[model samples]
Target: GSSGSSGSESLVVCDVAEDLVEKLRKFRFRKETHNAAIIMKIDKDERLVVLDEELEGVSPDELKDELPERQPRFIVYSYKYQHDDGRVSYPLCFIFSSPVGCKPEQQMMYAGSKNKLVQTAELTKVFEIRNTEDLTEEWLREKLGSGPSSG
Candidate 1:
C-alpha cells in the first residue's frame, strides 16, 4: 500500500499546492450567508488549484452552473440548513464532480488526487456526482439529512 512514485514516466498523480492548503484552512472557518463554495480543478502541472471561490450568497444550483459539463472538479462547500425545530446548521461538504463524458486520463488524474484535498481540508462529509445536473439544494439536503445524526 506504500508504493513510491520515484522514477515514473508520465506520472498520473498530483499533490495539493500550499496556497490551496492555506485557503482551505481559512475557508473551513469562514462564516457566511446562503452558500459558500471553493471550486477547484487540476492544472497543467497536475497540481490542484483553486479556480474560484464564491464566498457568499451562492447556491448549489449556481455552483452546478459554474462547473464544466465535461470536466472534473473538486468543491468545498457550505450551506445553511434549517431543521424542523428551527435550528440552523451550516455543514461543510466535499463534492467530487466527475462528469460521465470526461476524458479517461482526466478522470484518473482527478480520482488519484482526490484524497489530497480531502485529507488536507480534514473534511468529514464527502459526496460525489457524475452529473452536474444532480447538484441542487434539494439533492444536497437529501444527502445531508440522510447522514447519521449524533448516532
Candidate 2:
C-alpha cells in the first residue's frame, strides 16, 4: 500500500541555536570595541541563526540599513551611553525588529519565540519597533532612558 505524498506542512516557532547563545554571552562582555552589534534571523529549518555581526563598530542607522523592511529580526547592540548627569556607561540592548505588514505566520512565529531568545541570551534591556526607519540612535536612547534599567 502506497501513501499519498505530503502536500503541506506547518511552520512551528524556531528555537535559538546553542552557538548563538554562547556568542551572546561573549558579546555581553566583549571589550574590544565600545560600539558593536549582532543580527539574528530564523532560518527555514526552524532555528535561530546569526545573520550578521559587526563587532568592531556599528551605528544604529548602519544597523538599520542591514535589516529588511518586511521581515522580523533580532538585534543585540552594545554601545557607549552618556547620562544626563555626565555619567558614561555601556549598555547591551536587545532590539526586536518586527515590521508592519509581514506575513501572519512569520509574525506569530517570531513573536512566540522572542521571549525564549531573550531568556536564553539573558538579555535585560529589550525593545521592539514596528518601523525600521525609527531605529535610530536617538530613538534607541529614548527607549533606554525611559525604560526600566534592569530585569
Candidate 3:
C-alpha cells in the first residue's frame, strides 16, 4: 500500500528591486503556454494591475485590498511535497530588488556556506576578449630570449 504525504516551508520578507521585477516580467519561460500556471506583471509607475496576460481594468485602490502598497521588499511564499516513491518537489521564488550594474551574463554562482561568502576559483574564464595578434611570434621569441629551436 502507498500513501501520499506532503511537507512545506516558507521564506518571507525578501527585498526585490524594481528593475529586477521588470527583468523577470520579460523573462521567457518554456513551461508557461498551456495554462498550467499564471504570470502577473506589476507596473510600479502606473500603479495598475495586469493579470494573466490581460488588463483587469481595476483601479489601484480597488486592487489595494488584494495588493499591498509597493514595498521596497517582497515576501516569498513556497511549498514542497513528497510522494510514495520518496520523491520530493518544490518551487523556488525570488524576491529582491535588482542591484545596480547587475548583469545576468556577468553573474556567477557562489559556492559556500549560507552564513559565509567564500571565494572559489572560477570554473570559466571571465575574459570577454582575447587578442592573439598582440602576442606575436616575435614577441614570444623576444620574451623567451633565444630558446633553442630544432631546424
Candidate 4:
C-alpha cells in the first residue's frame, strides 16, 4: 500500500475476486469514528479494484502476515503530510491486492505493533476464500449474516 501525505487524499487499487469486492463494500469498520468510511469500487477497464479513504490506518506488518507466504501480488500508492512542529501527523496509504497465482486461503491477516496502531477500526472479515473469482455479494451476506444496521 502507498502512504499518502498528511491531509492528502489517496487511492489504492486491488485486483481481488468479485465476491471479495462485494464483501468489502458492505464490510464495516467496527471501531471507526462516525465520520470515517471506506469507499470501494470496481474498475473493469483496468481489471483492478480501488479503495478511497480519509483518516484510515492499516498495519504493514499485519498485512505481510495476512497475505500468502508466497510472493503475493499487490501494490501501494501513498501520500504523507506532517506539521512543521511534527507534533501532528497524517498519512494515507493504499494497498492493492491482485489475484495472480494464489488462493484467498493463502493470504494472512494484517498485523502491526501497538505503538504503530494502524487501524482504529475492527475488520471482521479479511480473508474467507481461496480465489477472487469466488467472491460475491451472497458470500458476503452469508459471512456477515443478518446483523444490526451499520448506522
- Top candidate, metric TM-score: 1
- The digit string of per-residue lDDT tens for model 3 on 58-84 reads 321222223223221111211233466
Q: In candidate 4, how many Å is residue 137 off? A: 1.3
Instruction: Write the candidate numbers in order of decreasing lDDT.
Output: 1, 2, 4, 3
**All candidates: TM-score:** 0.80, 0.80, 0.17, 0.25
Of candidate 1, the 10-residue stretch with the lowest lDDT total is 5-14
lDDT of 2 by residue, 6-95 (tens): 543554566777767777887776756467777778777556655455445878877888877888878887757878899877788788
**Comparing 1 and 3 on lDDT, the stronger one:** 1
Off by over 4 Å in 3: 1-18, 22-74, 92-151
Per-residue lDDT tens digits of candidate 1, residues 1-151? 9997554345356777776777777777765456677877777754555555544668888788878789888888886778889998788878898888897767777877877778877888888889889999898887787864684
lDDT per residue (tens digit) for residues 86-109 in model 4: 763222232334345643332331
Which number leads on lDDT? 1
Q: What TM-score does structure 4 among the candidates reach?
A: 0.25
Report lDDT per candidate: 0.77, 0.76, 0.26, 0.34
